[PDB]
Amino acid sequence: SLITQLCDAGQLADYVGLGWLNAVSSQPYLVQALGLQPPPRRVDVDAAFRDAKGLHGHQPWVATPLPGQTVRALFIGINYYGTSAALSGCCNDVKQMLATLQKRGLPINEAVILVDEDNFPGRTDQPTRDNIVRYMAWLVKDAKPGDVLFFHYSGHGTQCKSRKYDQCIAPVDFQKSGCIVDDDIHKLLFSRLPEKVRLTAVFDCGHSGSIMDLPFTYVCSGGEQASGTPHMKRIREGNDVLGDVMMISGCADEQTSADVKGSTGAGGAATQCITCMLMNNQSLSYGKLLIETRDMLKRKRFKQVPQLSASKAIDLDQTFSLTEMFSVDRSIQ
Ligand SMILES: [Cl-]
Ligand SMILES: [Cl-]
Ligand code: NA
Ligand code: NA
Ligand code: NA
Ligand code: NA
Prior knowledge:
Blueprint: H1 45-52, E1 71-77, H2 90-103, E2 110-115, H3 129-141, E3 148-154, E4 157-160, E5 166-169, H4 174-177, E6 180-181, H5 182-190, E7 198-204, E8 216-219, E9 233-234, E10 244-251, H6 269-279, H7 286-299, E11 305-310
Helix pairs in contact: 1-3, 2-6, 3-5, 6-7
The protein binds chloride ion (2 copies) and sodium ion (NA) (4 copies).
One sodium ion binds at residues 191, 240.
PDB class: hydrolase
Keywords: hydrolase, cysteine peptidase, caspase/hemoglobin fold
Assembly: monomeric
């Protein structure tokens, strides 16, 4: 059962109290491009699920249980301290993610936190290639109808050579162990969910645009209005995802600029998008919330606009949530 009292297993983290909601930067940070990488070691999903046996998370805070549902979460933040790859804001993104989920009362049964920041309360382990792979398997391995899964990554996205380039993420030990290709992330995180499981995945990568091979997407570009009726669009033939996967990322505005012939930051946009969506206390639809969120990113000088991708065409009139299955937009084949 979920721990419902602070006297049950002792005191738990108060991330809001450590200033992680209100007293850390929510501004853009600099993300230098990593550059083209050598070929990665492709994932053996068998070995991943084997290495995940016996892994577990911990309950990060007390909250009100959702009847008929469990919640599992994996957070990955990578600053690449001391290297040419160093990023200032990725572990801070995870701080804000954790504090926002706590503030809003998401009842997480088990969380795993992979960050390279020292003295980070609740840190499970280092975000190495092998840890990311096995804990991705951990997140999805026990999934049953009604379950809710949450995934957050803030770190480098880049390209790696094949054995045409692949999009990939860089673990903290990428220099030794190589990157993880988006196809393998899709196979670990998305492909192995059964029906009636809900996942939300947030990828905060300054230089990717990748949508993890999902079949439907919606970009909340500059010409969208609250008085319009947005829809997702199909961008890939075929689909191997049974569950309800929703992904938040940032991408370039698809509206063509009126500039003919200001300052921004590329880091932190996806995290601000999801946290802004969660902090809005008015039970807005996906569509309306993405407008407000787009406006926040342009106000705060982020380079990116919001991108929502999914395993089904979500009716954007549906109320945004982390916990509910999608209402399908039947107009999108
Ligand atoms: Cl619950
Ligand atoms: Cl609709
Ligand atoms: Na915040
Ligand atoms: Na990068
Ligand atoms: Na598959
Ligand atoms: Na700003």
